[PDB]
Design an enzyme around this catalytic site. Structure first.
Site, short mmCIF file in Angstrom:
data_model
loop_
_atom_site.label_atom_id
_atom_site.label_comp_id
_atom_site.label_asym_id
_atom_site.label_seq_id
_atom_site.Cartn_x
_atom_site.Cartn_y
_atom_site.Cartn_z
N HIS A 67 0.58 -1.13 -0.14
CA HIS A 67 -0.21 -0.20 -0.25
C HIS A 67 0.79 1.15 0.54
O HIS A 67 0.31 2.46 0.24
CB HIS A 67 -0.96 0.18 1.31
CG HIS A 67 -2.03 -1.11 1.59
ND1 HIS A 67 -2.15 -1.47 0.42
CD2 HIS A 67 -1.41 -1.68 2.05
CE1 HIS A 67 -3.39 -2.75 1.31
NE2 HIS A 67 -2.83 -3.37 2.02
N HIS B 216 -5.04 3.95 -24.78
CA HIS B 216 -4.57 2.10 -25.68
C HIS B 216 -5.11 1.32 -24.23
O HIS B 216 -5.88 0.45 -24.76
CB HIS B 216 -2.89 2.05 -25.82
CG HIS B 216 -2.58 1.51 -25.05
ND1 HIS B 216 -1.63 2.03 -24.12
CD2 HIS B 216 -1.65 0.28 -24.55
CE1 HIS B 216 -0.93 1.97 -23.71
NE2 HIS B 216 -0.58 0.01 -23.47
N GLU C 62 -6.92 -8.78 0.70
CA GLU C 62 -6.69 -7.09 0.41
C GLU C 62 -7.15 -6.00 1.39
O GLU C 62 -8.90 -5.37 0.76
CB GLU C 62 -6.10 -6.45 -0.89
CG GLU C 62 -5.16 -7.69 -1.89
CD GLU C 62 -3.84 -7.62 -0.76
OE1 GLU C 62 -3.98 -7.12 0.28
OE2 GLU C 62 -3.13 -8.51 -1.30
N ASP D 42 -1.88 9.54 -25.25
CA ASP D 42 -1.65 8.51 -24.75
C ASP D 42 -2.38 8.31 -23.34
O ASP D 42 -1.75 8.17 -22.33
CB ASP D 42 -1.14 6.90 -25.05
CG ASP D 42 -1.12 5.64 -24.62
OD1 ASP D 42 -2.74 5.73 -24.40
OD2 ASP D 42 -0.33 4.99 -24.53
N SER E 27 1.29 -0.78 -18.43
CA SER E 27 0.88 0.25 -18.81
C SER E 27 -0.51 0.89 -18.55
O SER E 27 -1.05 0.46 -17.29
CB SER E 27 0.01 -0.17 -20.53
OG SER E 27 1.00 -0.80 -21.82
#
Length: 223
Positions: free
Chosen positions: A10, A41, A61, A86, A177
């Site tokens: 975290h 994208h 979690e 992007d 990404s």
């Protein structure tokens, strides 16, 4: 993330996981209680977004949230020219109540400084080609615009900047990404693309140059 380590749990509370069919395909970054910033994208018609995660199993979690979203605002010049601009903003179906493990981060207003050390984090592939079990962190150095522009000619566009590329082979990779590049505690970039294979000496990765987009980001979240 190539040649990184487990993030402290975290320690990157803005990190968002973008999952579909129980598989992560991108990350994003919480920039407002109801908005996740990611790479354009990574666009999908809708999203399952994991916040507060470390491993990708929300049941393991405590404090994490899995939330739905379907409104995406891609940057209006995304991919014009090829690969440029992007970024996109994802509106969560409801605002999250922020905590120590789910928290937004401010976007850098100053553009990147060559040589400065930054942090990138994600659940993308490791140096051995496998997927990590928990969020990975690695430090990469910003590369100069002249190096970025020549290495990625002719697709280099001022919506891009470069980081990494060192002999240490510390870099982002596939699956990273849309995740964050943090410089001096601000969100400086998003993982966008890089030449394959991951972790090449002399080949930095390309990051969305968020200092160029603060007006579009603010206007979109405000509207």
């Amino acid at each position: 993330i190539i040649n990184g380590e487990d993030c402290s749990p975290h320690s990157q509370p803005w990190q968002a996981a973008l999952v579909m069919e129980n598989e992560l395909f991108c990350s994003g970054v919480l920039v407002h209680p109801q908005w996740v910033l990611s790479a354009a994208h990574c666009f999908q018609n809708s999203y399952t977004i994991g916040l507060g995660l470390h491993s990708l199993e929300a049941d393991q979690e405590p404090g994490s949230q899995m939330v739905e979203a379907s409104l995406s605002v891609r940057h209006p010049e995304y991919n014009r020219p090829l690969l440029a601009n992007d970024l996109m903003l994802i509106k969560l179906d409801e605002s999250v109540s922020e905590s120590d493990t789910i928290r937004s981060i401010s976007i850098a207003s100053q553009c990147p400084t060559a040589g400065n050390s930054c942090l990138v984090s994600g659940w993308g592939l490791l140096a051995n080609g496998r997927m990590p079990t928990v969020l990975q962190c690695v430090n990469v150095s910003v590369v100069s615009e002249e190096v970025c522009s020549k290495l990625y000619d002719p697709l280099y566009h001022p919506s891009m900047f470069c980081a990494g590329g060192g002999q240490d082979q510390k870099d982002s990779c596939n699956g990273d990404s849309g995740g964050p590049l943090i410089c001096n505690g601000y969100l400086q970039g998003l993982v966008s693309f890089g030449k394959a294979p991951c972790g090449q000496v002399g080949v930095p990765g390309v990051y969305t140059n968020l200092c160029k987009f603060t007006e579009w980001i603010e206007k979109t979240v405000q509207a």
